[PDB]
Amino acid sequence: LPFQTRSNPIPWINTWLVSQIDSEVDTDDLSNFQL
Amino acid sequence: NLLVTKRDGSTERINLDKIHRVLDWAAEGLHNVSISQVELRSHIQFYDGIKTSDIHETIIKAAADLISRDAPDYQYLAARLAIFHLRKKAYGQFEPPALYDHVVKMVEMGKYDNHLLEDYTEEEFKQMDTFIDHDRDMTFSYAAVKQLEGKYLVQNRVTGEIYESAQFLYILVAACLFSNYPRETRLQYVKRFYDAVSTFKISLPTPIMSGVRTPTRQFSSCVLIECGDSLDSINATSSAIVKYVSQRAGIGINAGRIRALGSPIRGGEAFHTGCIPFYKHFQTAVKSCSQGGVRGGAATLFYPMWHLEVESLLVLKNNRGVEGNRVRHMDYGVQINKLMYTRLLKGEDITLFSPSDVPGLYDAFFADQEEFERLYTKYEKDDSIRKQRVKAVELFSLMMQERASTGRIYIQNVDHCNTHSPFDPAIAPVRQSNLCLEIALPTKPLNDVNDENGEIALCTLSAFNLGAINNLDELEELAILAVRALDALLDYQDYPIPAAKRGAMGRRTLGIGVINFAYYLAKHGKRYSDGSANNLTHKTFEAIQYYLLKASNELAKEQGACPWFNETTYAKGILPIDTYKKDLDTIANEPLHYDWEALRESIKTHGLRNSTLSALMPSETSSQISNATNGIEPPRGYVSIKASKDGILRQVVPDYEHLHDAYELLWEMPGNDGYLQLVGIMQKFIDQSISANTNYDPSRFPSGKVPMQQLLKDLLTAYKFGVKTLYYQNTRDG
Numbered sequence: 001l002p003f004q005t006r007s008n009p010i011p012w013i014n015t016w017l018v019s020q021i022d023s024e025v026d027t028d029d030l031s032n033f034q035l
Numbered sequence: 036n037l038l039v040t041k042r043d044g045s046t047e048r049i050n051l052d053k054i055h056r057v058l059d060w061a062a063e064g065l066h067n068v069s070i071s072q073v074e075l076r077s078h079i080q081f082y083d084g085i086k087t088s089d090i091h092e093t094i095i096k097a098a099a100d101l102i103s104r105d106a107p108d109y110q111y112l113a114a115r116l117a118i119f120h121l122r123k124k125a126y127g128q129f130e131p132p133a134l135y136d137h138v139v140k141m142v143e144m145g146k147y148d149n150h151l152l153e154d155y156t157e158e159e160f161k162q163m164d165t166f167i168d169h170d171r172d173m174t175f176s177y178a179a180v181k182q183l184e185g186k187y188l189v190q191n192r193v194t195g196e197i198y199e200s201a202q203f204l205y206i207l208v209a210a211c212l213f214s215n216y217p218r219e220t221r222l223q224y225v226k227r228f229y230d231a232v233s234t235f236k237i238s239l240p241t242p243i244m245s246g247v248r249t250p251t252r253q254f255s256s257c258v259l260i261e262c263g264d265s266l267d268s269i270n271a272t273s274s275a276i277v278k279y280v281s282q283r284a285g286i287g288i289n290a291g292r293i294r295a296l297g298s299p300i301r302g303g304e305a306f307h308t309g310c311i312p313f314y315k316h317f318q319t320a321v322k323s324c325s326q327g328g329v330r331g332g333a334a335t336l337f338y339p340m341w342h343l344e345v346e347s348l349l350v351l352k353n354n355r356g357v358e359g360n361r362v363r364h365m366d367y368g369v370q371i372n373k374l375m376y377t378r379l380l381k382g383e384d385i386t387l388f389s390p391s392d393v394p395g396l397y398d399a400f401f402a403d404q405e406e407f408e409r410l411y412t413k414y415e416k417d418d419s420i421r422k423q424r425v426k427a428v429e430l431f432s433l434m435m436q437e438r439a440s441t442g443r444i445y446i447q448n449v450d451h452c453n454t455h456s457p458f459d460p461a462i463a464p465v466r467q468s469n470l471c472l473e474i475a476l477p478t479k480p481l482n483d484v485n486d487e488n489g490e491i492a493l494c495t496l497s498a499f500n501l502g503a504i505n506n507l508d509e510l511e512e513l514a515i516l517a518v519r520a521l522d523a524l525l526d527y528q529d530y531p532i533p534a535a536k537r538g539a540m541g542r543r544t545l546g547i548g549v550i551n552f553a554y555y556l557a558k559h560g561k562r563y564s565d566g567s568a569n570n571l572t573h574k575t576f577e578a579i580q581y582y583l584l585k586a587s588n589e590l591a592k593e594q595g596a597c598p599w600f601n602e603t604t605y606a607k608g609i610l611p612i613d614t615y616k617k618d619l620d621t622i623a624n625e626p627l628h629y630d631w632e633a634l635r636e637s638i639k640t641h642g643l644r645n646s647t648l649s650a651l652m653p654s655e656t657s658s659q660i661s662n663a664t665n666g667i668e669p670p671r672g673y674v675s676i677k678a679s680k681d682g683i684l685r686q687v688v689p690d691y692e693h694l695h696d697a698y699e700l701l702w703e704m705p706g707n708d709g710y711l712q713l714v715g716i717m718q719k720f721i722d723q724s725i726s727a728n729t730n731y732d733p734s735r736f737p738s739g740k741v742p743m744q745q746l747l748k749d750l751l752t753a754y755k756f757g758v759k760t761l762y763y764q765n766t767r768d769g
């Protein structure tokens with residue numbers, strides 16, 4: 001490589017070169033709780 | 036051969052080299068930017084006589100919209116372009132004038148407060164001009180600069196004329212707050228606090244940013260008004276709202292005391308029209324004005340879950356009804372306690388009462404949980420009292436359903452707000468919250484606009500940038516600078532409502548939060564969902580509270596504790612490490628690293644300058660100044676789209692290039708358990724509350740629908756770990 005690494009200075013050129021609620025509730029499962 | 040119109044009105048031949056020079060300067064040192072891209076994306080339409088100021092605004096927009104993951108440095112190119120444009124708008128040149136020459140002209144124009152010239156001499160102003168580093172404007176991001184020119188920099192809200200720059204805002208906010216300090220240490224603090232906020236160690240809220248140096252002195256973000264069950268209180272509440280929304284404030288209204296529709300008035304001389312007609316009156320009070328011309332007026336209204344009209348109030352934002360029983364443009368917070376949750380778990384009913392038919396049931400609902408259960412079960416059996424039973428499963432389903440569709444039906448667990456608070460529930464209970472559900476302070480209803488007996492809760496805010504600290508011990512120095520600057524602000528500002536000044540001077544409540552928490556977790560390689568940040572969150576927020584309490588404790592030694600300190604639980608020698616919810620012991624085992632017992636003794640002896648100190652606010656706008664991730668929330672994406680008065684803004688996560696893997700984005704989270712656990716751990720130390728968000732992705736669920744089972748299980752999970760309040764419910768769509 002003869003030049004320094006560089007990002008593409010014209011990136012725009014690449015466009016030219018390549019182509020509800022599940023309302024069901026289970027109280028027993030919720031009852032298995034301790035606040 | 037065509038001509039451009041310069042800033043001074045003169046014209047010269049169009050020279051594209053002028054544009055190349057500007058952009059090459061703004062792209063200097065940046066990686067992966069393109070001068071050519073900015074010019075071509077500008078689509079700049081030249082015409083003979085085109086204004087040069089409009090030309091520059093075009094290339095700022097173009098460079099701003101090029102902010103991407105592949106080119107994150109455009110956030111700095113567009114910022115440098117925007118600072119340049121803002122220098123010209125206020126000064127006509129690049130170099131800002133002297134600090135004295137500027138303040139002189141501005142106080143002369145009535146744009147600055149008069150006291151700046153009286154409290155500081157020209158020799159003192161020139162000394163602070165040496166503190167200023169105007170090159171720190173080159174460390175902002177584009178989102179920060181747009182919020183500066185859009186909301187914070189002193190400007191004309193009819194002309195659009197920009198008057199100041201960024202570094203003047205900082206040094207004068209520091210000057211005004213410590214202006215009343217002793218001269219042997221005044222400029223010592225003014226330099227230190229300027230350095231803290233200009234290098235993004237401390238974040239200042241919107242009213243402090245846009246206010247502190249202006250004639251009109253109101254800088255409290257949150258105003259909490261309690262409404263009694265009388266017309267005089269309703270009239271007083273309405274007047275206070277109008278005054279405070281007009282002065283940069285977000286209101287929290289407690290209209291739960293208003294009796295239910297159909298209740299007798301004067302023993303039957305009148306039929307009570309209901310709560311909703313008064314709620315409509317509160318809405319027009321909020322919407323009548325703007326928040327000092329910065330943003331629009333907003334308010335959140337609170338009522339107990341057991342109110343008789345609760346089924347009508349839960350749907351007030353629901354568009355599926357007539358305007359008569361809809362109050363859409365206000366948010367609401369449903370107040371719940373342990374007994375209400377118990378009725379759900381046991382599949383039992385919930386009885387609804389009007390607060391006027393249950394003596395002492397309302398006050399017990401907050402201050403005395405045992406007294407509430409006694410009166411509640413008692414009045415449930417009384418057949419003379421007007422009541423209405425609803426299945427707890429149905430009432431909760433309606434609430435969470437309205438919470439899910441609007442996103443603005445909030446929850447406040449009133450028992451946690453009093454059993455684990457800095458206040459004695461028997462002396463000064465917490466009966467409400469604020470617009471964003473992070474403030475919890477005592478309130479007493481008013482009987483007149485100038486009623487001396489009522490109390491309106493004010494809270495002044497600021498935030499610690501967790502991404503800017505390298506050691507948790509930096510918070511000791513930061514808490515001193517933050518608490519001192521905010522406590523001085525309480526004496527510096529004005530109060531349009533006497534009842535509010537009473538609370539602000541009596542308790543001197545502050546609300547200091549955090550920003551850049553998601554970037555903080557990324558730096559430590561932790562995440563929200565997995566629970567790997569539990570012990571880190573515990574260690575972090577212990578230091579935040581400890582150094583905050585310590586700072587206000589030393590400030591109490593220096594200038595005396597707040598007048599109403601005897602009403603706090605800190606006065607009884609009680610610390611947050613005592614009253615926290617014990618379920619946190621099963622999700623975090625991090626030990627306390629600081630000497631809390633010595634602090635407990637010193638607080639018992641010298642007191643606190645401030646009744647509260649910590650509260651975790653969203654910092655929706657203010658966090659963008661330091662390009663931080665807002666509050667404790669995880670960013671929506673690596674490049675987030677945020678709102679602005681002009682249009683849309685692109686904000687890159689801090690340190691994206693080195694940490695894009697360490698971040699856990701909002702919708703990359705499986706559920707809410709990991710986040711709510713972190714909130715519960717934070718709440719162990721925070722005096723007030725946290726603007727906790729719940730998030731749900733419908734695509735993550737079978738049939739693409741979010742179950743009510745999960746909404747309720749998360750709500751119970753939040754209560755199990757002592758979460759005081761619940762803010763937004765974000766629902767994905769993409």
Ligand SMILES: Nc1ncnc2c1ncn2[C@H]1C[C@H](O)[C@@H](COP(=O)(O)OP(=O)(O)OP(=O)(O)O)O1
Nearest residue numbers: 039041042048049050053054057087090091123127
């Ligand atoms: N002759 C020109 N033709 C076209 N564009 C120009 C010209 N000179 C400057 N510009 C562009 C470059 C900048 O990005 C943008 C703002 O320039 P700026 O220097 O702030 O305006 P100005 O030169 O009229 O004011 P000032 O007198 O403060 O320099 O205008």
Ligand SMILES: Nc1ncnc2c1ncn2[C@H]1C[C@H](O)[C@@H](COP(=O)(O)OP(=O)(O)OP(=O)(O)O)O1
Nearest residue numbers: 041047052053054055056057058059060061119129
């Ligand atoms: N040290 C620096 N600080 C800030 N800007 C710089 C610096 N060095 C170079 N620049 C850039 C910023 C401007 O785009 C340009 C000079 O600005 P400006 O005075 O507007 O010149 P100009 O090209 O508009 O000519 P004129 O203003 O005389 O029409 O150089």
Ligand SMILES: Nc1ncnc2c1ncn2[C@H]1C[C@H](O)[C@@H](COP(=O)(O)OP(=O)(O)OP(=O)(O)O)O1
Nearest residue numbers: 264265266267293294299300301302305306307308
């Ligand atoms: N004429 C009215 N029409 C509709 N609602 C009213 C009327 N007067 C009062 N209200 C509402 C507002 C209050 O929430 C509640 C009681 O108002 P308030 O001014 O306390 O009444 P009061 O003190 O004259 O008699 P009481 O309090 O015994 O009913 O009823």
Ligand SMILES: O=c1ccn([C@@H]2O[C@H](COP(=O)(O)OP(=O)(O)O)[C@@H](O)[C@H]2O)c(=O)[nH]1
Nearest residue numbers: 240241256257284285652653654655656657
């Ligand atoms: O649109 C808004 C957003 C916030 N706030 C107030 O600001 C406080 C904290 O909000 P945040 O810190 O997110 O706002 P910022 O000060 O960062 O703009 C809230 O409790 C509100 O009282 C407001 O009045 N209007």
Ligand SMILES: [Mg+2]
Nearest residue numbers: 041042053087
């Ligand atoms: Mg020029």
Ligand SMILES: [Mg+2]
Nearest residue numbers: 264265266301
């Ligand atoms: Mg009355």
